[PDB]
Amino acid sequence: MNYARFITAASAARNPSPIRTMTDILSRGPKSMISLAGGLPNPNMFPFKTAVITVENGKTIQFGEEMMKRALQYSPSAGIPELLSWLKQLQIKLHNPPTIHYPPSQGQMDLCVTSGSQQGLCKVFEMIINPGDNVLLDEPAYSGTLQSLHPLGCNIINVASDESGIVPDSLRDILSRWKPEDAKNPQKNTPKFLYTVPNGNNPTGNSLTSERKKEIYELARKYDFLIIEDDPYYFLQFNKFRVPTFLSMDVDGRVIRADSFSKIISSGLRIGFLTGPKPLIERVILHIQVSTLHPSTFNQLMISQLLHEWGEEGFMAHVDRVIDFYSNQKDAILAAADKWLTGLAEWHVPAAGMFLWIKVKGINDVKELIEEKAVKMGVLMLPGNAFYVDSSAPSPYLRASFSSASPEQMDVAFQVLAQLIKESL
């Protein structure tokens, strides 16, 4: 409602940047207009001329001469228009955000294609955080998010979490340190935002429930902080019905959502997108304008043509094939764990994503059990230390990936792990 509270002085100071009044006064004027004002290099010099890309369960994608010249040239900072338009309709279909027709100044929904979802997240953190600011999140958390927040000098306040994600009662108790009106008084530093991964948290695999999301949103309104919904496993949920998102209930315009195609379409193409209130999305776009400039035009056109041929039906059919694969992988790793973890460890069933979070019994720290003993036995799993702000503290947890391993490999790996646990007790 007052977005200036969430924008640093540096971010607010940004002004719009190049490739400007050249391809817009010419994108509506007469076809007889001569322009020597643009800053585009001549694309006829570029060496790639055509492309043919085959697609499984889809029409082959072809870039002819003219399309290739577009794919190899600069494009708009927020993304190419046909991809932005498709993605906007997808967000309306999946989330029907309340903010679609709000005035810009009070949070009109806006989208930005980013060079991966983490780029959007990083620029959002940089947009908001002054040194000393307080921010809320639940540990264990994605190590990359922790490493992104560390140099910004914010105080990370841990919110309790269990098998159903963030525990609202813990958030409420933490927030009771302040009065709601303190949010309009920056002297004692009410939290600027809550960050969470609401589906298939990396590393835990746990997901938030609908009732808790509603409680959390009410707290975000009461103490007027933003919700940063980092949802890269949104399309990798094993439940038949997806839990409503924070975006879908965001009547205030206080949610910034990051979506990713890295798990379902491609991680290497570096294409994700942000959805959020226009004043905040605009600050991110302005930062992109002086940084990457835009996501690869070529990769955007690959994805946009794929998605347009698929339609929303073909897209959802693809996600359902991917869910089917990962859910079978999940069943397989759970079977191996049931077989070989013998009351030697505890674990919750992942609700989404690609990781199993294992607590080993009777051992206080497992990085020595793995990085020393397990490595020479030919098995590797990741100690949980890296997913806490204080990574030097001992952790009895391991993160095991089921994205790729065959059932045989899982059986072997957990046999080895079981032996090591038993001979280490």
Author numbering: 1 to 425
Sentences from the paper on this structure:
Our focus here is on KAT-II, which is a biologically active homodimer, and reportedly produces almost 75% of KYNA in human brain. The KATs irreversibly convert l-kynurenine (l-KYN), the main intermediate of the kynurenine pathway into KYNA, an endogenous neuroactive agent in CNS, as part of the main route of the tryptophan degradation pathway. KAT-II consists of 425 amino acid residues with its catalytic site at the homodimeric interface. PLP acts as a coenzyme and is covalently linked to Lys263 by a “Schiff base” reaction, resulting in an aldimine linkage.
In this paper the native structure of hKAT-II (PLP form) at 1.83 Å has been determined and refined, providing the highest resolution structure reported. The crystals belonged to the novel tetragonal space group P43212 with unit cell dimensions of a = 102.46 Å, b = 102.46 Å and c = 86.24 Å (α, β and γ = 90°). The asymmetric unit contains one molecule with an estimated solvent content of 48.1%. The state in which the side chain amino group of Lys263 forms an aldimine bond with PLP, also referred to as the resting state is the state of the hKAT-II observed with no ambiguity in the electron density maps. Also the N-terminal arm is observed rolled into the location away from the active site, which does not otherwise affect the active site pocket. The oxygen of the pyridine ring hydroxyl moiety of LLP interacts with Asn202 and Tyr233, and the pyridine ring is also sitting parallel to and alongside the Tyr142 ring.
